[PDB]
Amino acid sequence: LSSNFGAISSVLNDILSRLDPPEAEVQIDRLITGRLQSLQTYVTQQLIR
Amino acid sequence: APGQTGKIADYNYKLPDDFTGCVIAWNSNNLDSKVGGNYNYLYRLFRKSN
């Protein structure tokens, strides 16, 4: 979670703070695709184990 | 522009980020710019709610 995955802020709330939807949409898109990819890796690892 | 901020943007006429259309503008000096100075046009810069 702490990792940014290319995004400019770790905590999503800090992004919400000043970044506006025109840029916030793309920023959160990058962040959420990164986090979801990490969760996908974790669930796959759990599946094999 | 979708999501841009400003007095015209948030106070006058906002536009969704999912907007699907065209913005077509041209200088209207030959039409609007006159000796009267066309001050009838107004914007609502100050407003309680965007």
From Swiss-Prot, chain B:
Outcome, altering residue 43 to F: In strain: B.1.1.298
Known outcome of mutating residue 36 to S: In strain: Omicron/BA.1, Omicron/BA.2.75, Omicron/XBB.1.5, Omicron/EG.5.1
Recorded superkingdom: Viruses
Renumbered residue ranges of the record's region Immunodominant HLA epitope recognized by the CD8+: 38-46
Subunit structure: Binds to host ACE2. RBD also interacts with the N-linked glycan on 'Asn-90' of ACE2. Cleavage of S generates a polybasic C-terminal sequence on S1 that binds to host Neuropilin-1 (NRP1) and Neuropilin-2 (NRP2) receptors. Interacts with host integrin alpha-5/beta-1 (ITGA5:ITGB1) and with ACE2 in complex with integrin alpha-5/beta-1 (ITGA5:ITGB1). May interact via cytoplasmic c-terminus with M protein. May interact (via N-terminus) with host bilirubin and biliverdin, thereby preventing antibody binding to the SARS-CoV-2 spike NTD via an allosteric mechanism.
Role according to the record: Attaches the virion to the cell membrane by interacting with host receptor, initiating the infection. The major receptor is host ACE2. When S2/S2' has been cleaved, binding to the receptor triggers direct fusion at the cell membrane. When S2/S2' has not been cleaved, binding to the receptor results in internalization of the virus by endocytosis using host TFRC and GRM2 and leading to fusion of the virion membrane with the host endosomal membrane. Alternatively, may use NRP1/NRP2 and integrin as entry receptors.
Protein known as: Spike protein S1
Native organism taxonomy: Viruses, Riboviria, Orthornavirae, Pisuviricota, Pisoniviricetes
